[PDB]
Amino acid sequence: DYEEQQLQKEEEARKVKSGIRQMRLFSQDECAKIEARIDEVVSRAEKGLYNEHTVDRAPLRNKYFFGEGYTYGAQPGQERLYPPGDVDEIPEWVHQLVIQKLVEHRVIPEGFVNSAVINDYQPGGCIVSHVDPIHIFERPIVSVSFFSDSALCFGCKFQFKPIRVSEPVLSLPVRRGSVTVLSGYAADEITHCIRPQDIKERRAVIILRKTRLDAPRL
Ligand SMILES: [Mn+2]
């Protein structure tokens, strides 16, 4: 049975990989300049200069929503965009330093991205198993990593089983300055998550997405 389980995990991992594209697009210098602006965002949030729904604080992780943000609404799936104008606009530097570079290297089309979420993790931070809500966001899902090298996990059923019973279907290395593009199986047909032990130093990720025109709002 365990041999079968193992072969099955390998097969699923192949399928996950089919929907993953990665590249290193930001040099150490570009990363440093972007990292300084991420620190500016954190500073302005701590000064209380953003709207309430822009900033979501948790013990080992903060989220900063720009352009569009979402939350669980009263109950498609339950996630809902905030009302228009509730979250702060995407900062110019995200357009100029990050998105424009992605467009230049043909990762996404011009005018695709209208949502930018900055996730800032301290060592030990955790994200629950999830699929990016398909009734909110079009594919592909793009993420850009900063401050340190880490890992993104796919197939996250292990989160709900005892330690030593299960493991991620795929652990994907995500290096500082790398761009990760999720489509097909990887974005639609399996969960992803982050494990505390994989965050060894501060890690930040800029998640760049397109909201559906018909995405429901609160
Ligand atoms: Mn996600």
Numbering used by the authors: 70 to 144, 150 to 292
Q: What did the publication describing this PDB structure actually write?
A:
Two human 2-oxoglutarate (2OG) and iron-dependent oxygenase enzymes, the fat mass and obesity-associated protein (FTO) and AlkB homologue 5 (ALKBH5) have been found to catalyze m6A demethylation, indicating that RNA methylation/demethylation is a dynamic modification. Importantly, further work identified m6A in single-stranded RNA (ssRNA) as a substrate for ALKBH5 (12); m6A in mRNA was also shown to be a substrate for FTO. 2OG oxygenases are structurally characterized by having a core double-stranded β-helix-fold (DSBH), which acts as a scaffold for a conserved HXD/E…H triad of residues.
As observed in other 2OG oxygenase structures, the conserved DSBH core fold of ALKBH5 consists of eight anti-parallel β-strands βI–VIII (β6–13), which form two β-sheets: the major β-sheet (strands β6, 8, 11 and 13) and the minor β-sheet (strands β7, 9, 10, 12). The DSBH acts as the scaffold for the three Fe(II)-ligating residues His204, Asp206 and His266. Mn(II) is observed bound in the Fe(II) binding site, and the 2OG binding pocket is positioned in a cavity between the two β-sheets of the DSBH with the more open end of the cavity apparently providing substrate access to the active site, a feature common to all 2OG-dependent oxygenases. The active site openings of both Chains A and B are buried at the interface between the two chains in the asymmetric unit. The βIV–V loop, which is known to be involved in substrate binding in other 2OG oxygenases, is apparently constrained by a disulfide bond between Cys230 of the βIV-V loop and Cys267 of DSBH strand βVII and by interactions with the N-terminal helix α1. Modification of Cys200 was observed in electron density maps. Subsequent refinement led to assignment of the modification as arising from the reaction of IOX3 with the Cys200 side chain with the loss of chlorine.
